[PDB]
């Protein structure tokens, strides 16, 4: 149902970044194609971090993979094999609620 909120514990968002839009578009499509994510979002960002001792500001693409706990490990292993960085950003968030309809769509897609 489209209007009922439910508590959820098995949904996961995995956030990473890559340098170019072509890379991100390729990773997103390949993850959905492989059944490792139901949906992947990309948005351009600026990132500031220290590298080789100096502050760097770089344009990057922030990716959000929407997946379940059951595919999370396989997604992270797969990304490490395909990610262009030696040491990719990798943070996982847990949604605590969703709609029944969206949770069902997500699980069905995986």
């Amino acid at each position: 149902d489209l209007s009922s909120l439910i508590e959820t514990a098995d949904l996961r968002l995995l956030l990473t970044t890559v340098s170019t839009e072509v890379e991100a578009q390729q990773l997103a499509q390949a993850a959905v194609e492989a059944g490792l994510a139901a949906c992947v979002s990309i948005t351009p960002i600026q990132s500031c971090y220290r590298w080789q001792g100096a502050i760097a500001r770089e344009t990057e693409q922030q990716m959000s993979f929407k997946t379940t706990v059951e595919q999370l490990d396989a997604l992270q292993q797969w990304l490490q094999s395909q990610h262009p960085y030696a040491l990719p950003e990798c943070l996982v968030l847990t949604p605590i609620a969703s709609s029944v309809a969206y949770r069902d769509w997500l699980r069905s897609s995986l």
Copy 2:
């Protein structure tokens, strides 16, 4: 300074057009269902009815409390009853005292 929070919520959803996001944002805040809404364009790749679609969408992030969340979620779905929108709720673990207070006072 920081305080641990259990009752604040961020509702994340997507809509197809910028005009819809702007209208929803305004009306949700006007109604006291959210205190603040942010909108960010994104490109999304997803599985829909077997196939892979790539679309530009507006990511919306609504700042609310657990008390208004069910109401906000239902209201949003009433505005695009044809769609099956992204609905993901996050819970912040902390906030400032002042921000938490402003947010709560903004809801109706």
Copy 3:
């Protein structure tokens, strides 16, 4: 390398009006050892403030930090933020790669 449950990593979220303000804050936070990484995303924001509903363009900021630096980043940010009442919302990731968790902790 593999995923590991995390309890000590934090994402502090805030907004500022302009890209220049965002860049300056980000750089200073990193330089001061209060955050490991800062991301900046252009957004539109709708909120209730000063008795009205405004829509403005803003920069969304996400500070990557640990719990050990969080109080100090928050205190510092309060003194340096251009806004009267800064957005202050903290998220906790539930996992990360071993390498990235180690990078983040090590960078601070």
